[PDB]
């Protein structure tokens, strides 16, 4: 608390600068006045610079500590569920009964999607990526509901975020069945979230789906843990486009894109392959397939992490709820000795142990809907699906705040003015 | 080096910071390390930050100073053309005849958009706004065009950027057609490119269109004139987006839907509705909308900018323009003389010298807009496409500073640690 | 009961409205359209064709009528149910979504 007093700055004349600390971690140097000073920092990527006060999550890093509205990570995993999990991210405490009697009502009412957005579907290639399509739907959401764009009225972002929360789902479940070839299932009121969520996604008319509670935690967990991870690529792009006045389904669009940025990265992408694909007890095991890593793509084949240091604190329900999901499938899993074997290789190996390439949630979220029979392609769309509440939150986080379009400046390196006479003569 | 020659920041230990120097505007503190040290600024709006370095656009907007790659705007807009622009922008030195040649055959080349993308179309509604509807088809171009995602791979860039350039016309006309019911109209080969989207616009199967060579120039003044505005709100989106690695079409959809923002409010079209809604002199001013605007009602129509100072040096020319198109026409502009005196107000009402409320390039710009028959509800659908090859020099540039992650930071000022006990059940 | 379904390529009929038509301009519309895919109970003076004829427009009008709502408000069709009352199925087609059962007030 000490030096937070203040603090200050010149090079041809003196300014004082507050210190500002937070409720967790470290302080920071409220700059909000050199702007009209005619002072300006220089900061590409925004590494050290703060760009907003938040209450939503908490995240310290070297520590493997993850908060959401205060509360552990752990403990919402195994004791709350994904609608519950909702409510508390984006309204800021755990609900009484009544209040998430009301929640879930609201949510259960608008599940549907028009049918004729319904019919947008059918005009994508039945071989586009699934990840492709989810974009390109969430992107076209404006043109049907034109009633809630004004971000400016707050009943409007009301609505919105409940169309978005509850028809994701719905969303992404129509991704997957339109991509296999079978009917499009409708939301079921009876069913939970989650339960509902592999109604959609594995029901056929031929007979009627029961889901395997076991199966069911395992994905409400999935949920819960994807919820939100405070501000990174994605949620800066919702942030960024938000506060720039563009409605809130562009907007969760923009950010389903850039959650699937790193995936079709090249790099990533080649090394996406050779994963999913060798894998034949001969290669993974006697380190074949793993003595090819020229491309890094780790964290995407779920190994290490960008912020925490020693492990990913997601991880830990993750992984027992994996042990759980591969027994309760009893004997059908035998390729499935390489995630076994790889988890090994990440905790017994030099290299990994340097470079700390440890297994993170997605390796064993990975591991979880593999059993499951759900393609790799539905990976990112499940996670987009489930991150959806927490781009709600901060979107409507930012909006709260005081409404103040960014506008970041330049520094112009170009040429200086000079008179234009064209070469051409068209 | 005027004001700033090398400066302290002062906390416990006098830290000495290195001041760059652009080749014109203001010099910059650099701070780049800081974070690497613990300490981090506060800077909510970014009213102090330097996002970037930049050569594409300088503004001046005390001094009215537009400069795309050091040539000005006004000579650009009278000795240039659309294309030739693009090409600077997108190359930062005017082509030379062969260069020129060789682009202008490469865009003409991918001008039409596959079959299957019609049919999606074709799914919207028809009452569906045709900016909702540019927003849907951007952002789904990634299901198809899937070959040219790679944004590390410089042959997938250009690809990109050259099919974005190429199609959005086509689109834009596209929707225009759509939403009143007349068929699509494809390329012309042999058309220039203000004169093919005139011909995509506004032909039919009955008969041949003749572009009227005013017209054409009117409108290639306009796509010049809106290419791109350095550092905006809608460009932030763009790089942005970009950073984290999206796909170029999610993220020329995100600066789309960005553009469209601040129009979704209810004043907002409630403002700029009579300003067409009736046409004749005393009726939309005369003792009427003197206050019969509420929330922005001003900024929206055409009038002032937070950028420029005086004047806004784009509508230097475009004003000129809109003589030459109003005496053309003739009779389809003369009934519309209701401009001048709404800019006789803006010229002498006390109220509009006060908020400086000066006419802007967009009031002029829909003045011709409204005198081709433009319907309102494709203003911004035009804008936008010209400002696409903006979009897409930016999102260039920023990924030859190597992809620069804008990665912002948070104060957290929400709960600490809590225990989660829940008090529910459903 | 036996002839309350309309057959599915007039059905394919409504899809080519537009979604913000007037219910009343569309249910004008697919009656007017109707002789187009029943040519065989045309000729009024055959007394066979009335009867057949009458039934056809008895049975089928409350399942087209809830087609212009459900095609209005963007929710799926509902088939007729022979179980159900003339209004009760018509409150059933008119509600009822494929969500939850529907069950109508007496």
Not at 3 to 23: C, I, Q, S, Y
Not at 127 to 137: F, R
């Amino acid at each position: 608390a000490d030096t937070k007093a203040k603090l200050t700055l010149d090079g041809d004349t003196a300014v004082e600068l507050d210190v500002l600390k937070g409720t967790l971690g470290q302080d920071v140097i409220d700059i909000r006045t050199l702007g009209s000073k005619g002072v300006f920092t220089f900061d590409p990527g925004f590494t050290s610079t703060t760009s907003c006060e938040s209450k939503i999550t908490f995240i310290d890093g070297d520590e493997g500590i993850l908060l959401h509205r205060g509360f552990p990570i752990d403990q919402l995993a195994t004791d709350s569920n994904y609608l519950e999990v909702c409510y508390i991210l984006l309204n800021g405490e755990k609900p009484t009964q009544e209040q998430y009697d009301e929640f879930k009502t609201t949510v259960t009412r608008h599940t549907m999607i028009h049918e004729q957005i319904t019919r947008l579907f059918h005009a994508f290639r039945r071989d586009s990526h699934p990840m492709a399509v989810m974009c390109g739907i969430t992107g076209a959401l404006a043109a049907f509901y034109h009633d809630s764009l004004d971000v400016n009225n707050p009943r409007h972002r009301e609505i919105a975020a409940f169309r978005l929360l509850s028809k994701m789902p719905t969303m992404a479940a129509m991704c997957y069945k339109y991509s296999i070839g079978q009917p499009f299932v409708y939301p079921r009121n009876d069913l939970s979230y989650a339960g509902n969520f592999l109604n959609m996604m594995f029901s056929t008319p031929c007979e009627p789906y029961e889901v395997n509670p076991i199966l069911e935690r395992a994905m409400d967990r999935i949920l819960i843990l994807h919820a939100d991870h405070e501000q990174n690529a994605s949620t800066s792009t919702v942030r960024t486009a938000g506060s720039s006045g563009a409605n809130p389904f562009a907007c969760i669009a923009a950010g389903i894109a850039s959650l699937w940025g790193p995936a079709h990265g090249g790099a990533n992408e080649a090394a996406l392959k050779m994963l999913e694909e060798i894998g034949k007890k001969e290669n993974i095991p006697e380190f074949v397939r793993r003595a090819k890593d020229k491309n890094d793509s780790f964290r995407l084949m779920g190994f290490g992490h960008r912020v925490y240091k020693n492990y990913d604190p997601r991880a830990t329900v993750m992984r027992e709820t994996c042990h759980e999901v591969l027994k309760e499938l009893g004997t059908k899993d035998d390729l499935l000795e390489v995630a076994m074997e790889l988890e090994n290789i990440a905790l017994n190996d030099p290299y990994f142990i340097e470079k700390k390439l440890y297994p993170n949630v997605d390796f064993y979220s990975g591991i979880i809907l593999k059993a499951m029979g759900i393609p790799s392609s539905m990976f990112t769309v499940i996670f987009a699906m489930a991150r959806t509440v927490g781009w709600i939150a901060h979107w409507s986080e930012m909006h709260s705040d005081g409404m103040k379009i960014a506008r970041p400046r330049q520094l112009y390196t170009g040429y200086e003015k000079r008179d234009f006479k064209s070469d051409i003569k068209r």
